[PDB]
Amino acid sequence: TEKIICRDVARGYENVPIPCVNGVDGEPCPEDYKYISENCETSTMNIDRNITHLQHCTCVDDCSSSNCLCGQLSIRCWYDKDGRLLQEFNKIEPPLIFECNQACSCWRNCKNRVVQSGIKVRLQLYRTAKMGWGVRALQTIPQGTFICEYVGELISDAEADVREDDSYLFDLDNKDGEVYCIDARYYGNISRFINHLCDPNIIPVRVFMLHQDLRFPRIAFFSSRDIRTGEELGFDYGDRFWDIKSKYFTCQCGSEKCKHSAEAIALEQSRLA
Amino acid sequence: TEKIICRDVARGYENVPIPCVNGVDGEPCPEDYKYISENCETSTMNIDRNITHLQHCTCVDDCSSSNCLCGQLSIRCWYDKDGRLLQEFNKIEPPLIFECNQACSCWRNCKNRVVQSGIKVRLQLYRTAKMGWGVRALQTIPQGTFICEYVGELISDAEADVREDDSYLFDLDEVYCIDARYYGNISRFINHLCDPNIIPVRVFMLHQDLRFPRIAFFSSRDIRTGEELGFDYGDRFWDIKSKYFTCQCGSEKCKHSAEAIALEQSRLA
Ligand SMILES: C[S@@+](CC[C@H](N)C(=O)[O-])C[C@H]1O[C@@H](n2cnc3c(N)ncnc32)[C@H](O)[C@@H]1O
Ligand SMILES: C[S@@+](CC[C@H](N)C(=O)[O-])C[C@H]1O[C@@H](n2cnc3c(N)ncnc32)[C@H](O)[C@@H]1O
Ligand SMILES: CNc1cc(C)nc(Nc2ccc(OC)c(C3=CCNCCC3)c2)n1
Ligand SMILES: CNc1cc(C)nc(Nc2ccc(OC)c(C3=CCNCCC3)c2)n1
Ligand SMILES: [Zn+2]
Ligand SMILES: [Zn+2]
Ligand SMILES: [Zn+2]
Ligand SMILES: [Zn+2]
Ligand SMILES: [Zn+2]
Ligand SMILES: [Zn+2]
Ligand SMILES: [Zn+2]
Ligand SMILES: [Zn+2]
Fold first, then answer.
1. Superkingdom, according to UniProt (chain A)?
2. What is the C-alpha separation between B214 and B151, in angstroms, rounded?
3. Ordered DSSP codes for B85-126
4. By three-state DSSP, how is residue B61 classified?
5. Cα distances (angstroms) measured from residue B232 to each of B170, B192, B208, B220
6. Angle at A155 between CA A152 and CA A156, to 5 degrees
7. Which of A92, A177, B28, B43 has its CA 20 to 30 A from that of A239?
8. Closest Cα partner for A86 from A105, A62, A112?
9. B44 in contact with A at a CB cutoff of 8 Å?
10. Across chain A, which distance is largest between two alpha carbons, in Å?
11. Which residues contact A86 (CB under 8 A, 6 or more apart)?
12. Other residues' Cβ atoms within 10 Å of the Cβ of residue A28
C-alpha cells in the first residue's frame, strides 16, 4: 500500500513541494545525497558572470515579438504565449536557448523566461517496479511544457573520468575546447531520479539565463508529448551510458520499442553471426 | 500636484513593485542606470562559490535552537519569530550575520533566511524637496525590520579610485566596493540622514567569501508612513562633498549643514 514518506524532498527549495512515496518495497526517502535547486561548484569553474558580456534585448513589451534579440539567437523565440515549446520545435536537434537576462530591458515577467521561473508542474518521487526510484507526473502535462532542470555539481571531464559512481553524470555538449559535466551523485535536484526510457517522453534542452558562458549550458527538460497523470517520466540516456552499463544490468522500461532489453541485446549478438 | 511616473522601477524583479512619483518638479523616472535585484560583476571578482567551503548547520527544526551552528557563527541568531532583529541588537557596531545556506540541513523557510528572502515592505521612490530623488515608506515599519539590500557592481578600490562618479559607492570591510552608479537597485536612491532610521549590516548567504559581505539595511527604530529612509553616509563622504554642497536632511541634530559646517569651522578659529 502507498504512503507519503517525505512530504517534500526539495525541502521547499522549489516553487512547489515534491513528495516521495513507496508502495513497492521498504526502502525509505533516499538520503544518500544533498538536494539543491541550483547548480554548485566544488572546484573553481570561474563561470563568466560579466554583465557586459551578456547578450540582451531592448524590448519594452513582453518580448513576444520576433524582434527580440534574445529570441533571435535561437532563430525564433521557441516559447508560445503559455511558455510552451512551439509545436514545430526541433525535438531532435534542440538549438541553444537564450532566455532574457538581467541586462535586458524587458520586465522580469516577459515571455522569454520559462526555465528561469523554476518548476510549475506537480511531480512525485515514487518507487518503481524494477528501476528503483523514479519521477512521475501528478497531472496531465501538455507537450512542450517545462518540467524541471537537470541540476547537480559542475565538474570537468577529467574529474568525471575518475569518479566512483558514474550513474548520475550528464554531458554538457559544447562545440569547442574542453568538455564539462553535471554530476548529480552527491548534489542534485528531483531530476536525478528520472530513469531512462527506451520510448522517451521528455527531452533535454541547453539553456542560458543569468550568464552566457557557452562552457556551461543549464539543462532543462520539456515534455515531448502530452503526459497523463501518474505516468513515469524519462529521457533517452543515449548509447554512451548503455555501452558502459549493459554488462552490469538491463533496461526495464518495458516498451515494445525497447532497444536495450536483455532480449533485444542478445538479439543483436545473435544477429552478429 | 503629484504624478505617478513609473509603476515599478524594479521592472518586477522585487517581491513587490517600487513606484516612482514626482510632486515637486518635472524630472521623470530616472533612466541613466540599470536596475538589478542582485549584485553583478563586470571584471572577475573570483568569489569563492565552493559549496564545500560553506559552513553549514545540521538542524532538523526551523533553526530556532541555540544549537544552530549558523546562528552561533553570528554569536547567536539575531532574528525574532517575525524576522526582525532583537531589541538587544548591537546597533552601533553590528556583527556579521551568517544566514542558512544551500548546504545547511534545514528547510528554505527556516528562521535564518530573512535578508535572502527579498524586500517585503512597501517602498516608494519620490522627488524630495532639496535632495533630488529619495526613498520613503508606505507603511509603518517596526524597528529591526529588514528593508532592502545595497545592490550594485562589485569593484576593487583600485577600480573605484578611478571611477568618474563616486556618489554611489558603498564600502565593505583586500578592499572592495559596491558601485551603484551604472548598476543598482532602489537603495541607490536612499539619501543621507544625520538622524538615520536605517543601519547597514554585513551578511552572508549563498557564499561565505569574507571579502564580499552583502549589505542589508534594517530599520534602527520604528518608521512612520511617509517618513524618508536614510543612513549616516559616514564622514568619508562628507569630508569630500562638503566643499561641493551641504546637507539638507533638515534635522535639528544635523552635522553637515551650511550652518553646522560653518559653526565648527569657526568653533575652531
Ligand atoms: C540517474 S539514476 C535514476 C534514479 C535511479 N532509479 C535511483 O533509484 O537512484 C540512473 C540509474 O537508475 C537505474 N536506471 C535508470 N533508468 C533505468 C532503466 N530504464 N532500466 C533500468 N535501470 C534504470 C540504473 O541503476 C541507473 O544507473
Ligand atoms: C546615493 S545618492 C542618493 C540619491 C540622490 N538623492 C538622487 O537623487 O539620485 C547620494 C547623492 O544624493 C544627494 N544627497 C544624498 N543625501 C543628501 C543630503 N543629506 N543632503 C544633500 N544631498 C544629498 C547628493 O547629490 C549625493 O551625492
Ligand atoms: C566518466 N567520465 C565521463 C566524461 C565525460 C565527458 N562524460 C561522461 N559521461 C557519462 C559517462 C557514463 C554515463 O553512464 C554510465 C553517463 C550517464 C549517466 C546517467 N545520466 C544520463 C546520461 C548518461 C554519462 N563521463
Ligand atoms: C574613489 N575611490 C574609493 C576607494 C575606496 C576603497 N572607497 C571609496 N569609497 C567612497 C568614496 C567616496 C564616497 O562619497 C564621496 C563614498 C560614499 C558614497 C555614497 N554612498 C554613501 C557612502 C559614502 C565612498 N572610494
Ligand atoms: Zn526581448
Ligand atoms: Zn531579453
Ligand atoms: Zn524579455
Ligand atoms: Zn528500454
Ligand atoms: Zn540551523
Ligand atoms: Zn544553517
Ligand atoms: Zn536554517
Ligand atoms: Zn544632516
1. Eukaryota
2. 8
3. BPTT--SSSPPPEE---TTSSS-TTSSS-SGGG---S-EEEE
4. coil
5. 12, 6, 27, 12
6. 150
7. A177
8. A112
9. yes
10. 65
11. A76, A78, A79, A80, A144
12. 9
Place of cell 536612499: B190
Q: Say which residue the cell 521612490 belongs to.
A: B125
- Which amino acid is residue B186, in one-letter code? I
Task: With beta carbons less than 8 A apart as the criterion, state whether A10 and A37 touch.
Answer: yes
Please give, rounded to a whole number of angstroms, the shortest distance from the CA of A121 to a CA of chain B.
19
Question: Which residue reads 571531464 in cell numbers?
Answer: A157
CA-based nearest residue in chain B for residue A61: B11
Domain residue limits, chain B: 1-269
User: Ligand 6 centre from B261 Cα, in Å?
Assistant: 48
Q: Name every residue whose Cβ is closer than 8 Å to that of residue B235 and which is 6 or more positions away in sequence.
A: none
Cα(A100) to ligand 6 centroid in Å equals 3
What are the phi and psi torsion angles at B262 (to 5°)? -90, -25
Identify the CA nearest to B194 among candidates B234, B160, B224, B222.
B234
Q: Which of B201, B154, B204 is nearest to B49 (CA)?
A: B204
